Structure 1
Amino acid sequence: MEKTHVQLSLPVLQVRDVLVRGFGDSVEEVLSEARQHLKDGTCGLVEVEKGVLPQLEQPYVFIKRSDARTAPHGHVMVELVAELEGIQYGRSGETLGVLVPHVGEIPVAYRKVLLRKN
């Protein structure tokens, strides 16, 4: 009974502030955990720049843009894609950032997305 998409406002974290630097130890686990933390409001976003991914833990969970129209209410439509050892699980659009657990770090901005749950 989950609606297919949910509007979320994600805290954007600087990489050196992140305390828990990934969601788990396999592709399937990190996708599962990321979805749980999104549902619970305990998921942050790190914008990818040079130096960022080597300071985070693989497998990575990205949010990627899933369509070019719409963006209803200022929320870019996105979906989850995981990466391990240079192989991606999912194909989608441009990366908005890498998801990490949020455990109370102070963000620098909030990023509004319309997330495809599955």
Structure 2
Amino acid sequence: KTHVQLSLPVLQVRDVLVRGFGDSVEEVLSEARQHLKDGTCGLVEVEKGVLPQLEQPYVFIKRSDAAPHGHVMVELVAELEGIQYGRSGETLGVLVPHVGEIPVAYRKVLLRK
């Protein structure tokens, strides 16, 4: 399927144990997509002070359209030293590996895959 319904655990930035997906734009997008498929991907909501506490390159989920079955349609955009790879809508948050941190909420998304 071109889209997959996912429920992403929303993590507090200070709980996150693995603060990024790797070392290059291509690696972080690759790893983010693998962790989304494997159900091992968390979401951190972006506010003042969050991104400097995570590792670049960043992987964002961005709204791709204006929401089937309660799932917002999203796509991946990476960022490294202020340049983004991809073009999309409003940021829903930054993706990180999930390694058992307790979430504060879930974010239902329809991931363009």
Q: TM-score, normalised by structure 1?
A: 0.95
Correspondence for 2:112: 116
Deviations 1:4-31 (A, max 9, x none): 0000000000000000000000000000
Task: Describe the SS at the equivalent of 1:79.
Answer: strand
Aligned-pair CA distance for 1:45: 0.1
Distance 2:57 2:63 in 1: 19
Distance 2:105 2:49 in 1: 20
Deviations 1:24-46 (A, max 9, x none): 00000000000000000000000
Deviations 1:47-93 (A, max 9, x none): 0000000000000000000011xx01000000000000000000000
Distance 1:67 1:73 in 2: 14
Query: Aligned to 2:69, which of 56, 60, 73?
Result: 73
Task: Describe the SS at the equivalent of 1:10.
Answer: strand
Q: TM-score, normalised by structure 2?
A: 1.00
Deviations 1:75-115 (A, max 9, x none): 00000000000000000000000000000000000000000
Distance 1:9 1:40 in 2: 12
1:15-94 aligned within 5 A: 15-68=13-66, 71-94=67-90
Task: Describe the SS at the equivalent of 2:102.
Answer: coil
Q: Pairwise CA RMSD of aligned residues?
A: 0.3
Q: What are the ranges of 5 or more consecutive residues in structure 2 without an aligned counterpart?
A: none
